[PDB]
């Protein structure tokens, strides 16, 4: 839909859409920018991720409200029908993001920072599919999330310092996957503890600004560990 707009204009409008809290627009502008075919810079990757996390974040919040009402109900078909409609729209957004990563962001991503970023996104969007999956492919959806997070993890440990914010956020989200999706709370706790401790030991190497960036995400790891232990 955005094929007649300049790449730079799509990026500019995505930033304006963020300021205006118009995340659906923001996502459509960044989809348009990806479909131009060029690789994305670090900032552009963040705009793509923020746009879709907000969109799918609202859908997930709505799905959880409707799923809760429906569980207390089982009235009429309406609560299930509406939960299903929201679910299909959420699945469609996750399929769109996965499609962008598959065509062709991941295969063109050769630096560790970009490749880890996109594989973490792939794990996250399969994770959102898994949250609403029930049937024949649910086990396969979970494995698809696991596989993406694991490849990202293997690259990040080889190529990034333990305080790198992407590496830290990948481990945080993979630990959530283990706790909430994989029914592996001990794997979740071990991953969060080891990630936290290895970052702590590397903070001495950092500037004041980078210290602030890494410690912010470390505190999210600590908040989870406090809830889980």
């Amino acid at each position: 839909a955005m094929g007649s707009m300049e790449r730079a204009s799509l990026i500019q409008k995505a930033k304006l859409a963020e300021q205006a809290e118009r995340y659906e627009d923001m996502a459509a502008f960044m989809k348009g920018a990806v479909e131009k075919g060029e690789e994305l810079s670090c900032e552009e990757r963040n705009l793509l991720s923020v746009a879709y996390k907000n969109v799918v974040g609202g859908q997930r919040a709505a799905w959880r409200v409707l799923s809760s009402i429906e569980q207390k109900s089982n009235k009429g078909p309406e609560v299930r029908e509406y939960r299903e409609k929201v679910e299909t729209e959420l699945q469609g957004v996750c399929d769109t993001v996965l499609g962008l990563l598959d065509s062709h962001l991941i295969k063109e991503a050769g630096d560790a920072e970009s490749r880890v970023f996109y594989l973490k996104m792939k794990g996250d969007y399969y994770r959102y599919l898994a949250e609403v999956a029930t049937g024949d492919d649910k086990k396969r959806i979970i494995d698809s999330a696991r596989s993406a997070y694991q490849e990202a993890m293997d690259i990040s440990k080889k190529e990034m310092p333990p305080t790198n914010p992407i590496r830290l956020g990948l481990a945080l989200n993979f630990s959530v996957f283990h706790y909430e999706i994989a029914n592996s709370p001990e794997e979740a706790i071990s991953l969060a503890k080891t990630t936290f401790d290895e970052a702590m030991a590397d903070l001495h190497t950092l500037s004041e600004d980078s210290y602030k960036d890494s410690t912010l995400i470390m505190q999210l790891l600590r908040d989870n560990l406090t809830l889980w232990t």
């Binding site: 963020e18 963040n46 991720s49 923020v50 996390k53 907000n54 974040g57 996250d124 956020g169 945080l172 989200n173 959530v176 706790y179 909430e180 979740a188 995400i217 999210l220 908040d223 989870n224 809830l227 889980w228």
Partner: peptide, 9 residues
């Protein structure tokens, strides 16, 4: 259990 907010930046 919270994941990366990731809703601003």
């Amino acid at each position: 259990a919270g994941s990366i907010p990731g809703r601003r930046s």
